């Protein structure tokens, strides 16, 4: 994905300020409340009935931490995304059967969580940068389908 040095500076700067414990927990928490059918995948995480149960679940926050870890890995190697997310594209496709529209949903919920945390620091130029990242990551994590 083609980023200029100003965009890549913005991405890395505001990524450096992220609290990498809570963000993944929030992002994945919001996903399960806003796009309910996604719950069907995590029915092994116990109670997910009321927004407060989803945000209060320890496994959700736990699993969230891994997801944001995987975004961080993929933000390191922007040059080679298909090589990075190889086993995951296999994982999410051949076993779980998560259809690829759901990836670009998770990406957009992420960007809403970041603007929530960084308030006015999340400017349009920064947003435009991160939109290109989470496109790549989604578009690359589902190429085993096609």
């Amino acid at each position: 994905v083609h980023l200029t040095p100003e965009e890549k500076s913005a991405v890395t700067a505001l990524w450096g300020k992220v609290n990498v414990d809570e963000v993944g927990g929030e992002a994945l928490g919001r996903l399960l409340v806003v796009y309910p059918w996604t719950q069907r995948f995590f029915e092994s995480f116990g109670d997910l009935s009321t927004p407060d149960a989803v945000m209060g679940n320890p496994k959700v926050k736990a699993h969230g931490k891994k997801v944001l870890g995987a975004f961080s890995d993929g933000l390191a190697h922007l040059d080679n995304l298909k090589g990075t997310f190889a086993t995951l594209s296999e994982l999410h496709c051949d076993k779980l059967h998560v259809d690829p529209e759901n990836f670009r949903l998770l990406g957009n919920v992420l960007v809403c969580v970041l603007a929530h945390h960084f308030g006015k620091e999340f400017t349009p130029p920064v947003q435009a940068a991160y939109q290109k990242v989470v496109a790549g990551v989604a578009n690359a994590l589902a190429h085993k389908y096609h």
Binding site: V33, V34, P51, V54, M55, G119, K120, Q127
Partner: protein, 141 residues
């Protein structure tokens, strides 16, 4: 469709936006043009630079049309009938581009009303915008 709990949430949360509707509408359009630049092609004759009076004016209108929609959240296809006639018959905006302006409004609210943006509000405001998008991209009456 829209639960009675979601109708409340939309009314309450859009109430808290209130009188900065012009500004939020403008910032939404501005994020959208930067993020997804193929959306510009619907506005060939505007001056889409930073801080144009054209865009700031347009955002006022959008934001007001959405305020009207929230007033009649129960009988929406009658209220929004002139807009449907514009966006659907004449302009022929395809419904993908509604999903980007709806995204860029939520980012904008979350960056300005952090306290009012709980999951339940996020969940309702998403359905609301989605309904509105569907009325404006169809040919009825």
């Amino acid at each position: 469709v829209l639960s009675p709990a979601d109708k409340t949430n939309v009314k309450a949360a859009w109430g808290k936006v209130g009188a900065h509707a012009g500004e939020y509408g403008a910032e939404a359009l501005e994020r959208m043009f930067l993020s997804f630049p193929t959306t510009k092609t619907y506005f060939p004759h505007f001056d889409l630079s930073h801080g144009s009076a054209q865009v700031k004016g347009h955002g006022k209108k959008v934001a007001d049309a959405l305020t009207n929609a929230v007033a009649h959240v129960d009988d929406m296809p009658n209220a929004l009938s002139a807009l449907s006639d514009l966006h659907a018959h004449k302009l022929r905006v395809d419904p993908v581009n509604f999903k980007l302006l709806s995204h860029c409004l939520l980012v904008t609210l979350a960056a300005h009303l952090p306290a009012e943006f709980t999951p339940a509000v996020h969940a309702s405001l998403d359905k609301f915008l989605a309904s509105v998008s569907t009325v404006l991209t169809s040919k009825y009456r």
